[PDB]
Design a protein around this ligand. Sequence first.
Ligand code: AMP
Length: 348
Amino acid sequence: HPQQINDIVHRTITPLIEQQKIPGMAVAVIYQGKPYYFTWGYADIAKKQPVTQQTLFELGSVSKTFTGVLGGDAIARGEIKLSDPATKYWPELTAKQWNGITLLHLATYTAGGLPLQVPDEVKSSSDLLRFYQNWQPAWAPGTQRLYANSSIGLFGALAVKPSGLSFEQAMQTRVFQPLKLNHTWINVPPPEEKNYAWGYREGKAVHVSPGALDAEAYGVKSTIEDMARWVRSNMNPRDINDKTLQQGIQLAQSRYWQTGDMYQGLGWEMLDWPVNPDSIAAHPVKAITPPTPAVRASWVHKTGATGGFGSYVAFIPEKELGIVMLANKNYPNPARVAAAWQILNALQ
Ligand SMILES: *P(=O)(O)OC[C@H]1O[C@@H](n2cnc3c(N)ncnc32)[C@H](O)[C@@H]1O
């Protein structure tokens, strides 16, 4: 490691762990293109199993970045357009409030107030259809952003329909495998279970429960090494020898809407670099026309949580600088962002 990386990471992450009382943590700092790894504490407190570079953490909503990119890849293939009505890919969704709602709206939380959570009793395909059929928008499409699992969750499920594959099969074959993310899972295979960290909520060991559209909205588990590779792939997509995937990664950093200081991509969210560290409910959106092609001078990021895990990813493509922070405790987002900003700001 470059000493300055060690110095700033030790300075920054050590206190964070102490005050947030985080039981285990992994961090990757991407600096001049290369990854540097750090680990702390335990994946399993009871068994005193240390966090390693092979420890799997629940990504929570960081999963949305994978879904956004997979959608981008489908657009690149000509399988979908974001301007297409959602009903084009689910004709059984006949209720009139769906007229005018597009894949873009689903992907970017702008469909008009889809709920943050899919109702907990929704399990089957018929349950899911009935849920969407009964949903009533609070706003017209394309006018308000309400960050929500039921929105991008449906986007992911519909985006993969033309492929003929399940969402998991599409993600595995079109995103995970081409990028050599060989320890990244929607469903952790039994032989890999020993590396799956427990999450901790009020001292209790927990893993995320099954829920409708979980794969699409929050269900990915990954290692610090794979997540470093993910960040690297999104920072320099032109380094990928897979045309539609490269194009998809670029489309996910297109700026489709603006809300205050931030811009909504597909899964990824973006702000202009340099950012004010203090700048990082529903809010009105303005369409950006044409959507701004991925801006390399951006803070590109996404936070994620499950009951037992807190995750954060941020990168600045212009500077070849990025960070992944994975912890097996859900701790406040401002703390994650503050630590990430301190580390990247020191290395620019
Ligand atoms: P992102 O990390 O913002 O959000 C995804 C996390 O939210 C929780 N989640 C989604 N859906 C539910 C339901 N129905 N009930 C309780 N919690 C839910 C999970 O923690 C996701 O990881």
